[PDB]
Structure formats: C-alpha cells, structure tokens
Design a protein around this ligand. Structure first.
Ligand code: HEM
Ligand SMILES: Oc1ccc(-c2n[nH]cc2Oc2ccccc2)c(O)c1
Length: 394
C-alpha cells in the first residue's frame, strides 16, 4: 500500500520531474495531498490550467476561509488574501498600476546603472561570485525601493523579512507576524514622511490626503506598500536567479544573446515560459460544483494550478523543454498567471530581467557555474524555488 501522491514534487528549480509529463498525459487533473494534510486537485495541462484561472468561481479570496482545505498556512492576515480586490474597491487600481510600470522617466537607466555597479563590484572582488545574493536580489531590492519611492538604505531590512514571509509552511509562523507588523509600521511611517513624494508610496501618500479617498483605511495604504515590495522583490529576484541558471546551462543561447542583444526580450519571454520559480500550484477554492476534465470538482474543494504543467505542455508548446525564440505564441505562457489575478507587475518583471541579463552578458560574457550544478542548495518549504547561493566564475 502507498499513501496519496504528495505535493510539491521537488524543490529543484533546474529540472522538471518526469512525473509532471506523466500526470499531464494520464491524469491532467488528479487528487494529491498538500503539506498540511489536506487533499486537493492538481491541474497540469495547459487547457485545464487556463480553464481554472479564467473561471472566477475558482476563487483566490475564498482560499482564506476558516476551515478550508489549505495548501499551506497563511503568512498574512486573511483579509490580505483579497489584496487586489481591496485595492480595486478603494478605487486605487489604476493608480497602483501606473506607479509600477517600468516606463517611469529614468527608471530603466537607474536599473542599468545599478546592475552595472553590482557587476563591477563582483569583478573587483574576483571569482567566485554569488549571483543571487550579490546580484539578482540586490538588483530586485534596489528596483523596488526606487519604484516605491523609499530610501535605498531601507531595502536590506525589508528584504530580510522575505525568507520567512514567503515560506510555504504546514503551520503558522510566529516570525512572519513579527516581521509583518514591523513592516506595516514602517510603511505607515512612510505615508506620514514629508520626504516621500515619488513612486508608489509618494502617490499613495497624496491620494491618502485627497477627499475622494478620505475613507480608505490607513491599514490598506500601508498594506499596499508591504505586499508590492515583498511580492515584487521575491518574484523578480527569484525569477532572474533561476533564469540565469537556465542561460548559463545553454552556452549556445548565451552566446547568441551576447552577440545580438536585441533578441534579449524574446529570450526572457522563453525564460519566463520555462521558469520553475513558483514552488507550488496556484491555489483556488471552488465556490460551486464545476466539471474540469474528467473530474467534478465540488464546492469547497482546493484546486492547484501547476504553472509548469501548462508551460511545458507539448500540445501548446511543441518541444517544450527547448528555448526557441521564434514561437508563434510566445507570450501565451502562464508565468504571470491568467484571468482575474494576472500579475499586475508583469511589465516591471520583464524589464528587470531584460536589463539584468543585458548587463551581465556585457560585463561577464564568459559567465559559467563555479560548482557542479548538483551542488546548488535548493530552498525547501518556500513559495519560490531558489538556490541559496549561485556561485559563478567568468
Ligand atoms: C518575473 C517576475 C514575476 C513573476 C514571475 C510573477 C508571477 C505572478 C503570478 C503567477 C501571479 C498570479 C498568482 C495567482 O493567480 O494566484 C502574480 C500575482 C501578483 N504579483 Fe507577480 N510576478 C512577478 C513580478 C511581480 C512584481 C514586480 C510585482 C509588484 C511590483 C508583483 C506583484 C504581484 C501581486 C501584488 C500579485 C497578486 C495579484 C492578485 O491578487 O490579483 N509581481 N505574480
Ligand atoms: O511582507 C510580505 C509581503 C507579502 C507576503 C505574502 N505572503 N503571501 C503572499 C504575500 O504577498 C501578497 C501579495 C499580494 C497579495 C497578497 C499577498 C508576506 O507574507 C509578507
């Protein structure tokens, strides 16, 4: 006898387990057990993943309900799970979206300057260098301080919350509350700080004092700062890091992008498609009985949308494991999700990776791993897959 198949399958972000293709072919929706002991439906084909993400009856908000089957423990207050809904209801959606576009004057030049400075410092210190801790993550942190309008020097402390904040735990995490409350207090202070007049926090600070937003809560304003910093930094840092691994392991592609940097955006789109940064399927709770493939999902059940299931589906992306810059459907991947909860930071995430890679290939065209790839240490029980260190030489 064996127990029910458990998720997640592997914390490794450098290879996809054979089990994914097996499931997709034989049972593209099937029952699994999560780390909490709850059962869930794991969805692994492009067609069924898209169906679930495009049907709001599969609800993000309702995953926070007391007594629901859980993927993992909440690390934020339950009301915050409906973060974008709260922002929308407060009439703040357009303003937030405008503030986080990569098109702000000077933002791209800031990114390039920052990337180049980080790389120069690594070159000065000499190989080996750690491209996660001393390149990808600081670049993400710097970008988000700039986008938020907050001091660069405050980035490191806010960043240190994230190795706990984005845990995927079977049980509640006491440290997550301590850090959350402290970070909320910080953002509340920012809203009252006369020095803060640019970026997302500068804009929220002004809207907060405008009559049309007088009954929007201070808690919501602070929460927007905390969640956008955290989600943005962890997502961009983790994606860039694992994308660099995929690039390093493809010297032919690395050379092509070095020689023809105009191809970098198409390269980054393919790196998004094959990215294994999300450690768990995206969770939704059924609010009705809904047929998905051969399964009638019942009201109250948990569904997990496996992004790499969709993104490596050969029925949608032929030769799915290969990076091919000339696909006819290049942005149709699910790396940023789909539907109601599509990533609001997609443009900024793309630009972060494009500029980081462009800078790295120019400064370190001979970049390569400094340890055998199996020596990378993959973070466990976390909402992202990432190597603890990424040692390179050049
Ligand atoms: C390569 C970088 C990024 C990737 C791969 C990524 C991925 C995703 C995905 C897959 C979702 C959907 C979650 C779901 O439907 O359950 C999402 C949502 C979200 N992302 Fe991103 N993201 C990235 C960058 C960013 C950035 C830069 C920001 C903000 C600055 C951000 C903020 C958010 C927020 C606030 C949500 C919640 C949306 C909602 O609840 O409707 N992300 N992200
Ligand atoms: O400082 C932070 C920031 C974000 C989170 C978080 N945990 N889980 C999901 C998180 O971030 C979001 C982001 C958007 C909507 C809801 C939550 C967190 O646990 C701490």
């Amino acid at each position: 006898a064996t127990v029910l198949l458990e998720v997640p399958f592997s914390a490794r972000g450098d290879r996809i387990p054979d089990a994914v293709a097996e499931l997709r072919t034989r049972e593209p929706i099937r029952k699994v057990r999560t780390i909490t002991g709850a059962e869930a439906w794991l969805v692994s084909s492009y067609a069924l993943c898209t169906q679930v993400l495009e049907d709001r009856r599969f609800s993000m908000k309702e995953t926070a309900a007391a007594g629901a089957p859980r993927l993992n423990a909440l690390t934020v207050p339950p009301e915050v799970v409906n973060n974008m809904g709260n922002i929308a209801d407060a009439g703040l959606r357009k303003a937030v979206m405008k503030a986080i576009t990569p098109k702000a004057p000077g933002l791209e030049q800031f990114l390039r300057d920052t990337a180049n400075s980080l790389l120069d410092n690594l070159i000065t210190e000499g190989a080996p260098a750690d491209l996660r801790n001393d390149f990808a993550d600081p670049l993400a942190t710097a970008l988000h301080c700039k986008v938020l309008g907050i001091p660069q020097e405050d980035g490191p402390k806010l960043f240190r919350s994230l190795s706990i904040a984005f845990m995927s735990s079977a049980d509640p995490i006491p440290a997550a509350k301590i850090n959350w409350d402290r970070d909320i207090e910080y953002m509340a202070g920012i809203l009252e700080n006369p020095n803060i007049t640019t970026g997302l926090m500068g804009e929220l600070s002004r809207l907060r004092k405008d009559p049309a937003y007088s009954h929007v809560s201070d808690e919501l304003f602070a929460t927007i700062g905390v969640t956008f910093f955290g989600a943005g930094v962890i997502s961009t840092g983790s994606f860039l890091t694992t994308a660099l691994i995929s690039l390093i392991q493809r010297p032919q592609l690395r050379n092509l992008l070095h020689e023809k940097p105009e191809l970098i955006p198409a390269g980054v789109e393919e790196l998004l498609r094959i990215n294994l940064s999300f450690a768990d399927g995206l969770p939704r709770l059924a609010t009705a009985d809904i047929q998905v493939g051969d399964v009638l999902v019942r009201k109250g059940e948990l569904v997990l949308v496996l992004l790499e299931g969709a993104n490596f589906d050969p029925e949608h992306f032929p030769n799915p494991g290969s990076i091919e810059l000339d696909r006819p459907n290049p942005t149709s991947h699910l790396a940023f999700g789909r539907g109601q909860h599509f990533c609001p930071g997609s443009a900024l995430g793309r630009r972060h990776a494009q500029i980081g890679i462009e800078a790295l290939l120019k400064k370190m065209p001979g970049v390569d791993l400094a340890v055998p790839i199996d020596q990378l240490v993959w973070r466990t029980r976390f909402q992202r897959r990432i190597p603890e260190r990424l040692p390179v030489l050049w």
